[PDB]
Amino acid sequence: EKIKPYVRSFSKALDELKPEIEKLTSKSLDEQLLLLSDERAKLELINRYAYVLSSLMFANMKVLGVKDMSPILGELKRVKSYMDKAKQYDNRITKSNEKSQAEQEKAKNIISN
Amino acid sequence: LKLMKKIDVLNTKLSSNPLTNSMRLEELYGKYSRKHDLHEDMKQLKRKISESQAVIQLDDLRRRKRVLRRLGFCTPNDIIELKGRVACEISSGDELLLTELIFNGNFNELKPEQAAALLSCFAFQERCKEAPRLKPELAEPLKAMREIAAKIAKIMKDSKIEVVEKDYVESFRHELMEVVYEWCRGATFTQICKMTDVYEGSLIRMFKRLEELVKELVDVANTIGNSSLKEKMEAVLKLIHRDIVSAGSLYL
Amino acid sequence: NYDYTPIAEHKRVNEARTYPFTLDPFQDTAISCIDRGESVLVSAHTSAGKTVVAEYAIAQSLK
Amino acid sequence: IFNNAIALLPETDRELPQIKHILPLLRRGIGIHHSGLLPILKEVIEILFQEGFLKVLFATETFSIGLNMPAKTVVFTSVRKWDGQQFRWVSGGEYIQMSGRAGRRGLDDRGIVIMMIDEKMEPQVAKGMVKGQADRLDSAFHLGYNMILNLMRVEGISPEFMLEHSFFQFQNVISVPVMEKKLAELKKDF
Amino acid sequence: SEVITITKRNGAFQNSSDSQIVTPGELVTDDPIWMRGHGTYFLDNMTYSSVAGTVSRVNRLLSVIPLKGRYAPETGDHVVGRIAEVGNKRWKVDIGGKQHAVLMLGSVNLPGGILRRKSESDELQMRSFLKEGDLLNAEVQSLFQDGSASLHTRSLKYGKLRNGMFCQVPSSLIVRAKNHTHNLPGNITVVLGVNGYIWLRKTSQMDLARDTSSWQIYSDENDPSISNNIRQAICRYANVIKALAFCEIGITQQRIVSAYEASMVYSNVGELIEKNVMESIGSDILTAEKMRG
Amino acid sequence: TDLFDVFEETPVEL
Amino acid sequence: NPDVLLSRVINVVRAASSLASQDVDFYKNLDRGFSKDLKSKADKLADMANEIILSIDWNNFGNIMDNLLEMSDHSLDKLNCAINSK
Amino acid sequence: REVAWVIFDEVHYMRDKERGVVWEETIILLPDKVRYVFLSATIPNAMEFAEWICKIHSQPCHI
């Protein structure tokens, strides 16, 4: 009775995500990188594969019902920390290009001035 | 109130079950339990034995597999790069550092008297009295190599390799550099004896160590083509291998 | 499964190095292991004469 | 004969200060042993020790290992000794290695063992020092990166292969078949 | 159903990832901080390339890797030598590289092993164990002052070849891995040299020993029992090598297996020589490279 | 709404 | 695509967060078949986690997360030389 | 390639926490045809060494 909605509901979410997994691991961790050239295009693919797996191993560990969840939780803020870094790096790439194009527009106006 | 409902099945279902205690099921429980304990404790032991299997050193090694890949000395397919090919003829010092120094190329504007003091930063281990802060054209390259190994040991700290980065630096000893700087200038053995407490054979015990270094340094530019280096390398070797360094023994 | 015969029985056919004085029983036991051709640890003190066992295998290598 | 030892040096090197100082002690039938001397100094002493001109040797742990230079009398001035961590009561086979250096085989009648002490030591410790024990020999295997290089550089074997036959896990070897036997028992009683 | 490819083209002599691509005579830079290695010459600042190749900047080391040249010998490599000559107690033997390797007299596995020790009569029998043109497995030891290197056979696994056939390729397409002896279904074995030399033979027990008498290490004998089903299976692996070589393909052991099963369209083994069909099977694998990994 | 906060919420519990 | 499939991951993350929130042992008492269905829904998890085991192919798990994050690090250091030197 | 006998003296330096790695590994890197000698100071646990060696180079070893 009480378990009867949630267990079929969550399994349907597994059923929902189950084709998404197979399209995610369609081509290999080498292949899906080796088809790509930009390391920025290589970047989050490493993360996102780990990003799901982190939640995946946090999910299945609940099914054993083990009272500990720390040594995957200890891995959790790690994966955040590396996701924290290159975004702030990629923020700085903007300011490299954001202001250099204003340098482009300014010096043309100087001869115009 | 809803918490007690877990027992409110056991209030029902335990009494409901056929032979709850009929057919000596209480005793047959311990009959099952004496089987069930044996069910527990073998594999409990057998986990221990399976835990007692493997090479326990792999966890060190698997960390070191990180290191060279982080250093680019090999591929992730472990295929050794020319970087890692360098120290194949290096055993006489920190091979982890000596590749990077030459790959940081800082000896291009070091003279044979200058870089030799940097090689005194390797060929000797035991601490002693403080040398003074020397002439900075030694010390700034000494400051330069110190900058290199930290980032190295940084990633070693990132490697889960339990090495104190600070203590990793004072693994390098920098004090005889002056005496090394002057034996390069043709100084007397008599005169340089005054500049330390460290006993005279122990000097030679790093001097004849230092030749083994510089000779293995000659190997490197052959493997790279730094023709300036090979000019500079044996230029050092001329300026150390001499008078008292020519010691031989009596039994032979 | 190795084919074993006792080394205490091993009649050494030849002194591949001969020696002037009376050798010791373990040294006697030592050189047979060299002569029969199997490796051996002997662990003694330095004054005992472990030297002498090393003297023997040179010539058996050299001959 | 001593000057013939100094004959293989330059004449500028024939006046070096430390050797000027030690030579009258060396003239006095007296020698000192430690590393800090010159190697040319290290060899000439032991000769004259082996030729008995120098009745006295002031020595450290190299000459304990440095054999073929026998003694008659061994003096233990410091009972304890620093082991990298502690000025400790010296263990057994240390002292046993540090024993036998006295007593020439065909010549000396006995071996003379004399230890100067400066504490009323516990009885089993002087036992555990002198009535000593042969010390246990176990692998101090660790890793080093130049080893890690060349096993990749040489193709035919692996660094893992080194660990499969490293004595450092022989600890993990020995007691387990007993526990297998216990498991072969426990798999039956079950 | 043919004999020869005769296709005609008359009236012409001929039918007619970013990095620095530099030429000889060309300046790279004049930052003095860079170090100057291979492919590089200079005058005190002026960094000058000497070949058609690529700028390699390693962290302060600048050097020029060419694209064209002979095989570069390096130590510890697993290659195949063809016996050029015999010297005093020396041998000369082609690598395919710039020069011959050398091979000491006692550098080889003796029949009976080390119990056979040294002898001066062995130089009276140099031609006994070895003679010209023969093929073997060799282990690159170390070099000379120039860049010429030497060999040896420190295993049972290294030694004189038999039981099959040689082929050769450019040295470029052979990829590096931690392993080089490979065993393929069909009971046969490739011995990929690094230098561009390729020997096939039937899988031995010693080959089988890798994955679970000694007096025959200079023989010209084979196993007498060689089926044609062995022999014809050799040729199918033989042409697909040249297929990838004509198609400029890095050799994967699996790609060969992928080449072999894709070749199962054609039972007529003589049809494995076609410029198009090799390219077609070459086109197959590259498309098949866009699925797995 | 940082994307690790879904690890942090308490669920809908009966 | 990140924003699609991770939103579906987030969808199942919350559903994974929705899973053991209820008391689950009570119907494991009331039948094995609840638990066995929960075992069978874990057999999805025994398959769906294995998909990235397959991408590679607990103490097993402690290994590869290093080797995952191994390859994260050599990006930014190359990105350091790709950008800060630039 | 012409060596069949090795005289290992000072075998107990395998417990050197500094250098004992070298003695251990070099013996692991031996071809198994070769005969060996082992000389060192008296240890109580000598057989463990022989018990280690006799497998890993697959020939008998006396003590």
Rounded Cα distance between A34 and B54, Å, is 34
Helix (H, G, I), strand (E, B) or coil at A107: helix
Checking H43-48 for CB contacts under 8 A at 24+ apart, the result is H43/C43, H43/D93, H43/D134, H43/D135, H43/D136, H43/D137, H43/H12, H44/D133, H44/D134, H44/D136, H45/D136, H45/D137, H45/D138, H46/C41, H46/C43, H46/D137, H48/D137, H48/D170, H48/D174
Beta strand residue intervals within B159-245, DSSP E: none
Phi then psi for residue D101, to 5 deg, are -70, -15
Nearest by Cα to D174 from B127, B49, E128: B49
All residues of chain C having their beta carbon less than 8 Å from the beta carbon of residue D105 are 47
Distances (CA, A) of B104 to B148, D68, E60, E227: 8, 49, 5, 60
Q: Determine contact, residues E138/E80, Cβ cutoff 8 Å.
A: yes
- Contact criterion met (CB < 8 Å) for D170 and H15: no
On whether the CB atoms of residues E54 and E22 are closer than 8 A, the answer is: yes
Helix (H) or strand (E) segment spanning residue D76: strand D73-76
In this structure, the strands spanning H61-62 and C39-43 are parallel
Nearest C-alpha in A relative to E293: A31
H46–C41 CB contact, under 8 Å:
yes
How far is H4 from H59, CA to CA, in rounded Å?
13
Q: A67 — contact with chain F (CB < 8 Å)?
A: no
Interchain CB contact of A2 with F (< 8 Å):
yes
Q: How far is the C-alpha of E149 from the C-alpha of E194, rounded, in Å?
A: 14
The answer to whether D30 and D6 are in contact (CB under 8 A) is no
| Contacts of residue D11, Cβ cutoff 8 Å, sequence gap at least 6 | none
Start-to-end C-alpha separation, chain D:
82
* Residue B141: closest CA among B168, B121, B167: B121
Name the residue in chain D with its Cα closest to that of C48: D105
Annotated binding-site residue numbers of C for ATP: 44-51
Q: Which of E43, E49, E45 is nearest to E32 (CA)?
A: E45
In the chain, the amino acid numbered A66 is V
Nearest-by-CA chain H residue for D143: H21
Residue in E94, E107, E99, E93 with CA at minimum distance from that of residue E141: E107
Q: What is the widest separation between alpha-carbon atoms in chain D?
A: 87
E22 in Cβ contact with E55 (< 8 Å): yes
Query: How many C-beta neighbours within 10 Å does residue E6 have?
Result: 6
C-alpha span between B197 and B175 (Å, rounded): 12
Residue type, E18: D
Is the Cα dihedral A18, A24, A29, A31 positive or negative?
positive
Tokens, residue G12: 């199942």
CA torsion angle C4 C6 C7 C8 (round to 10): 180
**For E45, phi and psi rounded to 5 degrees?**
-140, -40
Query: Coil, strand or helix: which one is C18?
Result: coil
The data reach a resolution, in angstroms, of 4.0
Contacts of G12 (CB under 8 A, 6+ apart): A13, A14, A16, A17, A55, A59
Q: Do chains G and B touch (3 or more CB pairs under 8 A)?
A: yes
| In the block, residue with structure tokens 């369209």 | E265
Cα–Cα distance for residue pair A35/B109, rounded to 1 Å: 43
C-alpha span between D150 and D145 (Å, rounded): 9
Task: Count CB atoms within 10 A of the CB of residue B149.
Answer: 20
Helix axes D39-50, B200-224, angle to 10 degrees: 130
Instruction: Inspect the interface and report whether the beta carbons of A77 and F14 lie closer than 8 Å.
Output: no
Closest C-alpha among D27, D38, D47, D63 to residue B250: D47
SS3 G47: helix
Beta-carbon contacts of residue E123 (< 8 Å; ≥ 6 apart): E88, E89, E105
* CA nearest to E286, candidates E255, E242, E240, E245: E255
Distance, in Å, from the CA atom of B107 to the CA atom of B114, rounded to the nearest integer, reads 9
Beta bridge partners of E85: E92
Counting Cβ atoms within 10 Å, is residue H21 exposed (0-12), middle (13-18) or buried (19+)? buried
Going by C-alpha positions, the residue among E74, G64, E172, E155 that lies closest to residue B80 is: E74
Report yes or no: D176 and B49 within 8 Å, Cβ to Cβ: yes
D111: left (phi over 0), alpha (psi -120 to 50) or beta: beta
| Residues linked to residue G22 through DSSP beta bridges, in sequence order | none
CA dihedral angle for residue A46, residue A47, residue A52, residue A57, rounded to 10 degrees: 90
Query: Strands, DSSP E only, in chain B?
Result: none
Give the CA distances from residue E202 to residues E109, E193, E270, in Å, rounded to whole numbers and listed in that order: 22, 17, 21
Between B58-70 and D145-153, two packed helices, what is the crossing angle to 10 degrees? Answer: 80
D31: helix, coil or strand? strand
Test D135 with H43 for CB contact under 8 angstroms: yes
Which residue spans within chain E are E strands per DSSP? 21-22, 35-36, 40-43, 46-49, 53-58, 61-66, 78-86, 91-94, 100-103, 135-143, 149-152, 164-168, 181-184, 188-192, 197-202
Contact present, E103 and E139 (Cβ < 8 Å): no
In DSSP terms, D74 is beta-bridged to D113
Q: Identify the three-state secondary structure at position B60.
A: helix
**Are H35 and C34 in contact (CB < 8 Å)?**
yes
Residue E36 makes CB contacts below 8 A (sequence gap 6+) with: B225, B226, B227, B228, E42, E47, E62, E63
Can you give the length of chain B in residues? 252
Binding residues of C: 44-51
Dmax over CA atoms of chain F, in Å, equals 27
D175: nearest Cα among A35, A41, B48: B48
Within chain H, what is the greatest distance between any pair of CA atoms?
35
Residue whose C-alpha is closest to residue B2's, from A40, A1, E242:
A1
Cβ contact, residue pair H41, C45, below 8 Å: yes
For tokens 């004509």, name the residue: E246
Q: Which helix or strand (DSSP H or E) is residue E39 part of? A: none
Which strand (E) or helix (H) includes residue A50?
Answer: helix A39-64
Could you give the C-alpha distances from D174 to B42, B52, C2, D170, in angstroms and in order? Answer: 19, 11, 22, 6
Contact present, E140 and D154 (Cβ < 8 Å): no
CB E113 within 8 A of CB H33: yes
Burial code of H28-59, b = ≥16 C-beta within 10 A, e = fewer? beeeeeebbbbbbbbbeebebbbebbbeebeb
Helix (H) or strand (E) holding G57: none
- Checking DSSP bridges between strand H5-9 and strand H35-40, what pairing results, if any? parallel
E42/E44 Cα distance (integer angstroms): 6
